[PDB]
Design a protein around this ligand. Sequence first.
Ligand SMILES: CO[C@H]1CN(Cc2cncs2)CC[C@H]1C
Length: 185
Amino acid sequence: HHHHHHMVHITLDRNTANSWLIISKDRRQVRMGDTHQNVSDNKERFSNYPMVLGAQRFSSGKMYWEVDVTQKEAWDLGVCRDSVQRKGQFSLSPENGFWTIWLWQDSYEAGTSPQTTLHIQVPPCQIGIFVDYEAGVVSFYNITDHGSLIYTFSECVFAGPLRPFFNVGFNYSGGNAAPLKLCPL
Ligand SMILES: CO[C@H]1CN(Cc2cncs2)CC[C@H]1C
């Protein structure tokens, strides 16, 4: 792909984070802690899952960023509406305001309803995410495999400002402690 020139500098919004997440000083890395991280509750925090939003809001234009997923067993990545539900249980779907892919139990899937199987021959260590607001497109790229396409959501109905979306996943196994990291431009 040739989307690299739309690169944006994403930082994580501490206030949106689940209370078990640990965000680095530079706001560019996040991981699951082994306990509550001693923060106050607020209406922005994702309560049920290890999720956090980027601070940036997008309502026009073309945007690109990259995320490092090295040695993780489970994660979700993409974008979401600013107004997504924060509390309780919900599915990641465009109907609920999410445009995402994930790794779970050694398979990759797109967050459609119902979910779509992805075909990835080279397990990615870094994921590229491209958003074209005007066109209604969210695309995912395998940076480890020379930028090959993973998935395109088209005919997206964003219906609001978009925020970068992250889920570090649970660590029930002891094999999923590694962070998500925003990769440098
Ligand atoms: C209902 O979700 C809660 C779960 N709790 C406890 C758990 C942590 N390790 C496995 S369950 C963490 C904060 C939030 C994600």
